[PDB]
Design a protein around this ligand. Structure first.
Ligand SMILES: *[C@@H]1O[C@H](CO)[C@@H](O[C@@H]2O[C@H](CO)[C@@H](O)[C@H](O)[C@H]2NC(C)=O)[C@H](O)[C@H]1NC(C)=O
Ligand SMILES: *[C@@H]1O[C@H](CO)[C@@H](O[C@@H]2O[C@H](CO)[C@@H](O)[C@H](O)[C@H]2NC(C)=O)[C@H](O)[C@H]1NC(C)=O
Ligand SMILES: *[C@@H]1O[C@H](CO)[C@@H](O)[C@H](O)[C@H]1NC(C)=O
Ligand SMILES: *[C@@H]1O[C@H](CO)[C@@H](O)[C@H](O)[C@H]1NC(C)=O
Ligand SMILES: *[C@@H]1O[C@H](CO)[C@@H](O)[C@H](O)[C@H]1NC(C)=O
Ligand SMILES: *[C@@H]1O[C@H](CO)[C@@H](O)[C@H](O)[C@H]1NC(C)=O
Ligand SMILES: *[C@@H]1O[C@H](CO)[C@@H](O)[C@H](O)[C@H]1NC(C)=O
Ligand SMILES: *[C@@H]1O[C@H](CO)[C@@H](O)[C@H](O)[C@H]1NC(C)=O
Ligand SMILES: *[C@@H]1O[C@H](CO)[C@@H](O)[C@H](O)[C@H]1NC(C)=O
Lengths: 50, 254, 361, 120, 49, 50
């Protein structure tokens, strides 16, 4: 009975950690973009359109 | 033959520090330049080990509970400590294990012995006094082997009862310290595994008298208890354990 | 490649299709020296055997037992097992063996059996219904019998109750055949229970004395000290063989090792806890266990519209262990190595590329 | 090498094919990454033998002729400071060719400015 | 808090250590992200009164 | 017993390949950034701040 519960909860936790890693990669990309905007729009004047 | 020893001096037992002693090889596996974390019955670092004396008038041979394992440290000169007494009730009702080292060889027997209340050996100044048992009825295992053996010699022993296997780990160390356990590192090699298959819950050291009444030769020994914990063992290039980390001692070693 | 890609046309490129294996050639089983044999010579071939009411029980333990010599002996007239197999005695392991030796009559040899009822079974030697082990019996007319009659072998003839299994009774109490009171005084209906056999050389087969040894096995929670013999083979080095060293099995190339073990150590492990070093139990020498040369089989081809010529890359495989060229990526078979440098068409790896112009690398 | 294990593993289908294909995609992606980073020039430029750059010294970043690896002293220090069915595929570009690409980029940006990145 | 569950879970190896390591990496990555975005100056400038 | 070992080792291999794919995405993002820096800082002079 605990073997069934362990494999179910371990699959749930592995799914959660995989989704968190993908979302953390997305948030890291957004934060790298935000740091680029902080460097190029706030700390200087940008010729890049939009 | 049994003799009550009635010329003892009453004194409470002592305690001292284990330092980084009691480490043994957990397995028969060579490891080279690697750090190995292992879960086994280990002796805790800097632990409270019970200290017993034999000095003249002190003669410390009590019976102590075995628990899950015994670390036996021996600061020995002139070979007073000769063996140990292993069993549960220490009478003819149950079956007991005998380890003796007399003047010729070491004898390991698993039989139904009638232990004396005060068992000892004796050396006349020549060993001519054996008073450790009064009977031997039903034997199941006999094993004769090669001998294991200022304080000059240091004898460390680990005894474990796991799945009917009796593991004896040992290490001989040349020391020159007078009173206490020296501080250092020495991993105990596996010597012999015994197929005993018996229940053991209590133990007792065997000493030797010096006759010239009786006189107790100068000796001191230490009893430590093995607990299930984790060690991080360091293996050098030559494959000997040179250092260890107790994972439950302090947060730094954790 | 067409089988792997599930298509009848293959585009230009390199395609990993299979996995090269160095197949194991031999099996090497090395087991330590067969010493400390069980003392079966002092039980089966002793000087004087015991009687059946006082059968001698020898405890066989802490030794290795060679039952093949006992089973292949043709002197035994009866070899009947009731809980095990005779051909699997050398394979199984037991905690201890009880050897019960006695002498009986030739017609009573069948009476040492589970479920068998007889005078020897009820009053002299009883086996349980769940008996395990083997009964061995052989004729001893040339040794035990005497021309004046061998009366030394006694047997119990009368008892009030039947035996429990593996129970001895050496008591000499006077039996009461009737209901008259007997205080140990013999009378008309009170007889001594132990009678002597009539072993003489003029009797035929059935009245001759038979020496019987009965082996009984115990399978308690004690460790199995009694095991069968181990047939170790010769050791073969420098080849991808299946090694079996003291119960540790695997596949690898066994070469000489410069690692100096401490004498208590038997196996060797790396960082990743894989057995890469081992000690042979027969001769105390240290052997490195290199894994066999597994590799990926890649097929280098142009398009099937262009040509059907292919080249094969065995990744991380030396060319002596498989237009043959050795690269750092592996062994490339079917491509002609040239000294000219071109642009990369089909990547091989480690700076090597392949192209079609035949296939060149 | 257990055949019973592989017979039971065939019941799970093409999981092994998916794992191998994902690892193959990662393996070719690493070579594509190195190709996009370092192979930005198709002309292998060299510096002139005389290093007269108006007082500017590039010896710590230009390749050392005395070293057999043809690396710069900075690149040599960088390479010194970095220390069961499993196989490691070698990279398509060796470290010597990546060093050659960086040497070509350095020679182009020293001798020709930004003109080599936009044309001749 | 079931010790039998953890004894059975130790048979599966270092899955839990892998998941804890991944979550710890995400947790320190968030602080790295905030550090990269907002801490682009080492001088705390002040407007005039 | 072999089925239990197969599903455990298959879960381990799937976990390894999934985290390798996530790390490959991170390394691909870093390499795209490195190729952008190679094009804009080495092959030219960049007006982009920091
Ligand atoms: C040594 O002392 C012990 C302890 O007093 C003796 O053991 C007792 O002996 C008496 C003698 O009748 C018994 O009634 C007790 O039951 C014993 N106690 C235990 C715990 O066993 C021992 O006999 C003495 N030795 C000799 C040789 O007299
Ligand atoms: C350019 O720089 C290098 C190193 O920074 C100079 O080489 C040094 O030259 C002096 C004297 O000639 C030696 O004592 C050093 O040992 C040299 N260092 C190395 C690392 O070689 C070099 O002189 C400079 N100028 C030119 C024109 O190359
Ligand atoms: C060891 O135990 C004794 C009694 O149990 C105690 O008095 C002593 O303080 C202990 N030693 C240490 C270092 O705690
Ligand atoms: C030591 O003990 C063994 C076993 O009891 C015995 O055979 C031997 O004679 C003893 N040695 C001496 C010197 O008494
Ligand atoms: C143990 O010994 C006693 C007396 O020596 C004997 O009566 C008993 O049968 C023996 N038991 C075993 C199991 O040998
Ligand atoms: C071993 O002995 C102890 C104390 O005599 C007892 O509590 C325990 O149940 C025994 N174990 C077995 C397996 O007999
Ligand atoms: C290992 O053994 C060699 C002898 O072969 C010795 O020179 C060296 O000092 C030893 N190293 C250690 C760490 O014990
Ligand atoms: C007597 O029996 C033993 C059984 O172990 C056997 O080894 C031995 O060879 C026998 N003796 C002869 C002369 O056959
Ligand atoms: C075991 O048998 C081999 C066979 O030749 C022999 O060389 C060796 O000395 C024996 N003993 C040990 C302890 O290996």
């Amino acid at each position: 009975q605990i073997d069934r519960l362990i494999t179910g909860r371990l699959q749930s936790l592995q799914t959660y950690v995989t989704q968190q890693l993908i979302r953390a990669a997305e948030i890291r990309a957004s934060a790298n973009l935000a740091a680029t905007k902080m460097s190029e729009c706030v700390l200087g004047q940008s010729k890049r359109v939009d | 033959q049994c003799v009550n020893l009635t010329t003892r001096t009453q004194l409470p037992p002592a305690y001292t520090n284990s330092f980084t002693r009691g480490v043994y090889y957990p397995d028969k596996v060579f490891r080279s330049s690697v750090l190995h974390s292992t879960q086994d019955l280990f002796l805790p670092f800097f632990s409270n080990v019970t200290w017993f004396h034999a000095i003249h008038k002190r003669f410390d041979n009590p019976v102590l509970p075995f628990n899950d394992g015994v670390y036996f440290a021996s600061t020995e000169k002139s070979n007073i400590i000769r063996g140990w007494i292993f069993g549960t009730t220490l009478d003819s009702k149950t079956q007991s294990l005998l380890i003796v080292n007399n003047a010729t060889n070491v004898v390991i027997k698993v039989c139904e012995f009638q232990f004396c209340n005060d068992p000892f050996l004796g050396v006349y100044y020549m060993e001519s006094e054996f008073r450790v048992y009064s009977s031997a009825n039903n034997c199941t295992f006999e094993y004769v082997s090669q001998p294991f053996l200022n304080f000059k010699n240091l004898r460390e022993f680990v005894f474990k009862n796991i799945d009917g296997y009796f593991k004896i780990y040992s290490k001989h160390t040349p020391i020159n310290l007078v009173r206490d356990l020296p501080q250092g590192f020495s991993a105990l090699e596996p010597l012999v595994d015994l197929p005993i298959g018996i229940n053991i819950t209590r133990f007792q050291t065997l000493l030797a008298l010096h006759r010239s009444g009786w006189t107790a030769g100068a000796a001191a020994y230490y009893v430590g208890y093995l607990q299930p914990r984790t060690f991080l063992l360091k293996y050098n290039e030559n494959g000997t354990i040179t250092d260890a980390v107790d994972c439950a001692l302090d947060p730094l070693s954790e | 490649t067409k089988c792997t890609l599930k298509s009848f046309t293959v585009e230009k490129g390199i395609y990993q299709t299979s996995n090269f294996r160095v197949q194991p050639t031999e099996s090497i089983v090395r087991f330590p020296n067969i010493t400390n044999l069980c003392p079966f010579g002092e039980v089966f071939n002793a000087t004087r055997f015991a009687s059946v009411y006082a059968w001698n029980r020898k405890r066989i333990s802490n030794c290795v037992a060679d039952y093949s010599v006992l089973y292949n002996s043709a002197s035994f007239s009866t070899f009947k097992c009731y809980g095990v197999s005779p051909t699997k005695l050398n394979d199984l392991c037991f905690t201890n063996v009880y050897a019960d030796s006695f002498v009986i009559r030739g017609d009573e040899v069948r009476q040492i059996a589970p479920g068998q009822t007889g005078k020897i079974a009820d009053y002299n030697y009883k086996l349980p219904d769940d008996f395990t082990g083997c009964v061995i019996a052989w004729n001893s007319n040339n040794l035990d019998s005497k021309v004046g009659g061998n009366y030394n072998y006694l047997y119990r003839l009368f008892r009030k109750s039947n035996l429990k299994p593996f129970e001895r009774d050496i008591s000499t109490e006077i039996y009461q055949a009737g209901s008259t009171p007997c205080n140990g005084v013999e009378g008309f209906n009170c007889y001594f229970p132990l009678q002597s056999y009539g072993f003489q050389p003029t009797y035929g087969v059935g009245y001759q004395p038979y020496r019987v040894v009965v082996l009984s096995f115990e399978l308690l929670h004690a460790p199995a000290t009694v095991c069968g013999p181990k047939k170790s083979t010769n050791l073969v080095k420098n080849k991808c063989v299946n090694f079996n060293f003291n119960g540790l099995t695997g596949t690898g190339v066994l070469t000489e090792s410069n690692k100096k073990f401490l004498p208590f150590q038997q196996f060797g492990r790396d960082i990743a806890d894989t057995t890469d070093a081992v000690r042979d139990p027969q001769t105390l020498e240290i052997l490195d266990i290199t894994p066999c040369s597994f590799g990926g089989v890649s097929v280098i081809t142009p398009g099937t519209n262009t040509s059907n010529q292919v080249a094969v890359l065995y990744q991380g495989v030396n060319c002596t262990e498989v237009n043959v060229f050795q690269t750092r990526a592996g062994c490339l078979i079917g491509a002609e190595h040239v000294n000219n440098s071109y642009e990369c068409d089909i990547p091989i790896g480690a700076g090597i590329c392949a192209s079609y112009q035949s296939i060149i690398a | 090498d257990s055949t019973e294990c592989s017979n039971l593993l065939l019941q799970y289908g093409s999981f092994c094919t998916q794992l191998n294909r994902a690892l193959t995609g990662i393996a070719v992606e690493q070579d594509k990454n190195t190709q996009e980073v370092f192979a930005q020039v198709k002309q292998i430029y060299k510096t002139p033998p005389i290093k007269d750059f108006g007082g500017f010294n590039f010896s710590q970043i230009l390749p050392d002729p005395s070293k057999p690896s043809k690396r710069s002293p900075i690149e040599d220090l960088l390479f010194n400071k970095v220390t069961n069915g499993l196989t490691v595929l070698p990279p398509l570009l060796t470290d010597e060719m990546i060093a050659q690409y960086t040497s070509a980029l350095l020679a182009g940006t020293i001798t020709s400015g930004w003109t080599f990145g936009a044309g001749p």
